[PDB]
A paper describes a structure:
α-l-Arabinofuranosidases (Abfs) hydrolyze non-reducing Araf groups of polysaccharides such as arabinoxylans and arabinans. More generalist Abfs that release Araf from both mono- and di-substituted Xylp residues have been found in GH51 and GH54 families. In this work, we identified a novel GH51 Abf (XacAbf51) that forms trimers in solution and can cope efficiently with both mono- and di-substitutions at terminal or internal xylopyranosyl units of arabinoxylan. As a typical GH51 enzyme, XacAbf51 harbors the active site in a (β/α)8-barrel that is tightly associated with a β-sandwich domain.
To elucidate the structural basis for the recognition of internal di-substitutions, the crystal structure of XacAbf51 was determined unveiling the existence of a pocket strategically arranged near to the − 1 subsite that can accommodate a second arabinofuranosyl decoration, a feature not described for any other GH51 Abf structurally characterized so far. The catalytic residues Glu182 (acid–base) and Glu304 (nucleophile) are positioned 3.7 Å apart from each other within the active site pocket. A glycerol molecule occupied the − 1 subsite in a conformation that mimics part of the Araf ring. All residues from this subsite are identical or semi-conserved between XacAbf51 and GH51 structures known so far, except for Cys80 and Cys186. These cysteine residues form a disulfide bridge in XacAbf51 and TxAbfD3, which likely contributes to the high thermostability of these enzymes. Structural superimposition of XacAbf51 with TxAbfD3 in complex with 32-α-l-arabinofuranosyl-xylotriose (XA3X) evidenced the presence of a cavity near to the − 1 subsite that could potentially accommodate the second Araf substitution of a di-substituted substrate. In the crystal structure of XacAbf51, six protein chains compose the asymmetric unit, but in a different spatial disposition from that observed for known GH51 hexamers such as TxAbfD3. Analysis of the crystal interfaces using jsPISA indicates that trimers, composed by ABC or DEF chains, are the most stable quaternary structure of XacAbf51. The small angle X-ray scattering (SAXS) curve of XacAbf51 revealed a radius of gyration (4.5 nm) and a low-resolution molecular envelope that are consistent with the crystallographic trimer. Except for XacAbf51, which is a trimer, the other structures reported so far are hexamers, indicating that the molecular diversity of GH51 enzymes include changes in quaternary structure besides modular rearrangements.
Author numbering:
A (entry chain C), C (entry chain B): 8 to 500
B (entry chain A): 4 to 500
Write the structure that this text describes.
Amino acid sequence: EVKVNGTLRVDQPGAQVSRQLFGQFAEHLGTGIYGGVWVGEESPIPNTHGYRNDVVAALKAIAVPNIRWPGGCFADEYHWRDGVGTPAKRPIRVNTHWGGVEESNRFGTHEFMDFTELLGTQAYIAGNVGDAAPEEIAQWAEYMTAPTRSSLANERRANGRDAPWQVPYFGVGNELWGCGGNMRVEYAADVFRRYQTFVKSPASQKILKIAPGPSDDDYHWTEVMMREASKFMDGLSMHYYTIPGGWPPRASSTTFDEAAWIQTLSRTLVMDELITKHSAIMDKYDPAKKVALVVDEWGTWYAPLPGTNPGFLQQQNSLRDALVASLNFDIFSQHAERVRMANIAQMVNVLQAMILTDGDKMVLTPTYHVFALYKPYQDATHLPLQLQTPQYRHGDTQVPAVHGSAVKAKDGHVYIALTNLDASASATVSVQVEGLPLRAVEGQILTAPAIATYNTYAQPQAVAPVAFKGARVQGKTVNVALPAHSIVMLKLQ
Amino acid sequence: SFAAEVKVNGTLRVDQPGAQVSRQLFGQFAEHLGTGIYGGVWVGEESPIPNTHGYRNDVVAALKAIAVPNIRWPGGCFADEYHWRDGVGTPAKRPIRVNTHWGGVEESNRFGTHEFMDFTELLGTQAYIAGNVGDAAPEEIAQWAEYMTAPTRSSLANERRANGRDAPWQVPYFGVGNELWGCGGNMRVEYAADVFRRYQTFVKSPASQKILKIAPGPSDDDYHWTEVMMREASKFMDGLSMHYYTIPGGWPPRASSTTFDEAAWIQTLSRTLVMDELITKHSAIMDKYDPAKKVALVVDEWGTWYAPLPGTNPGFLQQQNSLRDALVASLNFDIFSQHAERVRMANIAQMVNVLQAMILTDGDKMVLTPTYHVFALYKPYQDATHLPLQLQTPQYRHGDTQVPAVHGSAVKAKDGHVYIALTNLDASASATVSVQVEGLPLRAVEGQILTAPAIATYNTYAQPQAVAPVAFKGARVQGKTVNVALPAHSIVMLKLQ
Amino acid sequence: EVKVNGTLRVDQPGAQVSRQLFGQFAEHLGTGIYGGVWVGEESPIPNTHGYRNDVVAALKAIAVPNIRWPGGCFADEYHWRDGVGTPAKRPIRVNTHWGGVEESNRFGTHEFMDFTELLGTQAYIAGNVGDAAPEEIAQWAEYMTAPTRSSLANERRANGRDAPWQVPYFGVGNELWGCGGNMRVEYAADVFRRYQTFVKSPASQKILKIAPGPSDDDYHWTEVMMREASKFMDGLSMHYYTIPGGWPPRASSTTFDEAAWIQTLSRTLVMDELITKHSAIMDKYDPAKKVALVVDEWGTWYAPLPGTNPGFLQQQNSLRDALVASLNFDIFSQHAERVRMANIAQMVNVLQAMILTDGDKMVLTPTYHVFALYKPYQDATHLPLQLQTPQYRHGDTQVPAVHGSAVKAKDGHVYIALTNLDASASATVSVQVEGLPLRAVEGQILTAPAIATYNTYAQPQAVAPVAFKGARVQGKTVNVALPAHSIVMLKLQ
């Protein structure tokens, strides 16, 4: 009864779908670092040099491409020197944005950078422009990357790291329109131009610089930043949260009806319009697309769970959140020439997390499983997938009934992702494949019995992928019986 | 010499109570300047000048007696170059700095954060802290606020504790830059608004107290400054500062504080009255962006500025304080109280030994100025209720200058009594003032008068009460009328039963 | 065949030709400081307290009027505190612009300032605006100049200097349009206004403040800086390099034909148009001419010599460079009412140097000899000299065949400088002198047998001044037989 037709053009390959679209984001916020990543060398939670083993293994298994640290709003007040040297001598600071709680600085530059090397991931460092003078980020970059025998390099060596680390991405201010200094873009562009000057790449590696970009539909911000500074940036950040009910976040993460379901998906899909319009502005100043659009905060933002400190942003992660992730990956992959990095907010225990921990307990969220399903998209080639779908309507809201994307992976196999956004109606999908003879199709499905299903320590697999039985090939057509509220990932052979 | 007596008629509407006249209109201002801090307030624990923890006792008692509501510190121009860490920790380890604006003399930093904040607690007054925006990065004021107010066991809070203060202090007002159009960085307002927006971001209130933020506002009639600061930043400020000095003869200040004729008298009063026009016009601009009046207009520098006294360091701004200065203060209090919905803070420049001071000291000697006595007379205005007082007054004219012959204001005080202030601006003519009182049955009136035999009279160590308030016998009640025989060059404060 | 007629008006004296037009510029760059000036107390190169003796003597002999230090691009990242205190405790920094090499900071504030006193020259200090807060330059000025017992003054005393030094000129940012923070002028004007506020003169001496001005023909920069900030500056800097072939610098400093000769002189003469047009803008906002135009970078910029580190800007210095210097001195002296300071880039071993060193070897360049010839111009009086000259043409380029200038010196004598720009043709110059009875004339000539002649350690006097015998007086006329490619300086009795 819901019928979806489409075309896959394997013969019209497009741009690389960057692995950096699967970036993570670990702010010093709530238990995102302390408990979520760092437990300390003396913890009875099994750990490697203080990093909990369960989280390390889980993040390695989805091949995290980069982690942005330490913020976020925290980064615009962070002083990197507070986080180096003997732990006993590091100052206790106040985390002003996120509960006004004490920050021990036990997890600092060496602990984060060595964590990235343990995962085999890239570091995306967020520098302080709002409350520091430019010399702070200049010295931080030298400390981390200098191969010479300068005082800062020698101080890194004294602190136990002989060789430079790689710092491939460096954010030059975070949310400058808000928590980073309430700046008009005219002022922020001047500040960016100045502060970026003093972050210099040594001969031995290139540090790419990400300029502070718009929130939501702030097109004026993009216009000015690009007009004034496009020659001085390697990327421009944009931020868009999916916030059912609007700001401030009051929607339940655990308990919701179909109206809240469709509203959430409707809001998340706005990402496509935002990327389109911000990209078009970037094209006016940067037609060769040298500057990446960097979506370095996205995801859902709900009411805090009952009983939790609201400054710690703890929320559950349901099937709804899985669909949010699949729809955003689809959208990013459709804009792959310009959108070359993204970072979901946030990695562990905060906002739309991969993982929830509580002492030695750990659970993988439905969102984690979507990152796992879409692993073949990492550094794949975009393929055009054009779907002819009816709308799913509930009350005064409508969204596409089915959404999807496709790639040719580095192993040479074609993958098709499909999502059925309808809370109760299945769909029959028929995709005509051009440019590749088919014999077979294998797949996995992520769904659950109810839209509001989430994983817990006691029921860790309520939402988890299983083998999918509803895909078949006939002639040049892939036919899919796609259940309500589900995501499938199909591999053609 | 002689001038004929004048008639003034007026109406007092006790039945039309208006806005609260904030006690913060009586704010003081103690910059690190000349002997305003060193000698004027701080003598050190080992001084032979009688002192409590290094604060001279005589000044403490005098300031307590006028119920100082807040003190702004440490500037002024000094604040835009001050580094708060220079003023904390063991005194011998604090650096000696240079007071660049005010004589280029050494600043010992012996009077720093702890000494000022503990002084405010000794007086029972509020701290109005002036933060450095001009020559510091924003992290300095951010850390300063944490040091002073954090209740947690952060390193900065523990440093405050190490330096002898366990509990946080209260920091109810925080200035985010001082005179940014001038000594704070010669900024165009368009740039200052961006800088203010940025620096204010990082001054955060802990959960335990609210720190109000005062934005750097206009000098004199710089309406463009108010327009841009309000247009660009009104949502980020609790107050906007304005500055207006009374400078007879204009800048640079060359008029004598001790010796003057009637032309200089009326010129000074004419110039001081311009405050009303400035407040009116700056308020109207603020109304366009902030019609609910959430942002206070903060007059945080006002008062007279004269030539320095002969033989003094001109960078120390030492001037005498005469009957003329008393009238300047009474006229300004009248004006502020007429604008009480918007003007909710003011700070006279400056508290001890500097500009229009409350107190002058010289070693163990201390004298209370005529201006001090006006703060004392107007104490009942603190947190009082404004009452409309309309006066129909002739002009006082001398040469090509004219001012109202009589000026005044009224309140209903928290003690429940109605008070009426009247000032006769005429250097030689007495006035008969007849006030029709509505909404209050009249039984009795008493009062005090501040005057002197000559306009150019001031207080000295040798003649400490040449200008000082005494019982006033020239008010009478009849029916619904208060009749006042108001001498030339005088201020009266009347209390109705 | 080439005949030039002129008129000298000794009876119409003009403005003072400031000695500061002969300023030098010593950036921390290559071997300009380390090797070129500072060898260290432990060096076998003969030295006085670490300053090499040969360079000290040579610079004293041309009466250097001021030296600008320490940059240049280096100055916008320099932290003065790194260069004071016990040498063992000073941090090693990175010279990011000029090879990414280590900077020991052994040559710091005391070493530079005591060097200026040894030479009897003035210090022109270049302050950090780009990457520092304003408190740094404020404290630096106090450290150097405070006569009080402030902590900064006491620290100078502890470091071995009891009395203040004189700091007569202070640059408030360097190249803010580029290496100093990539600032548009509207932002730079706001930054200058703010930072200059906090550089204060003590009662005991006046510190003049130089505002960051235009590169080349950036008239918009001059317009905005003067419109917004002329009341806060004692001088406005301008920069103009003579770069044959254009940016990036690829022309040989050693080997060139007549086309490259005339192209270089044509490019250097553009200085006159730039000064004219920048001066006219300054006149609109500063009609009294209170603000000096300060040419604090000029000179030739060539390809780096073979085998050298390209970040050290090492080039040779030929007869062509001598004529560049004489033409620039002529031009500056014609604009002496407004142009009151200039600094050639750079003093030793860098760009159009006075001196080249290599270990204990030292050579004086052709450019040095032009500074020597023009010594009588120091604090002289400008005299109007009108020359009617044919053009020198080679291919599609033309320049005046002869160029010159004249002064009445403080020694009471009139001096006339003439340059023959032609690579091969001599000129006959006839100057009618008004307002001075003529008795005799003598002079010196700087030339060489070939245009591409330069000085080396093996041939240190290939280009050096000798007595000139080709001037004679007849009636009221000075007649000069002026050789091809030559500079003469004539002294009238």
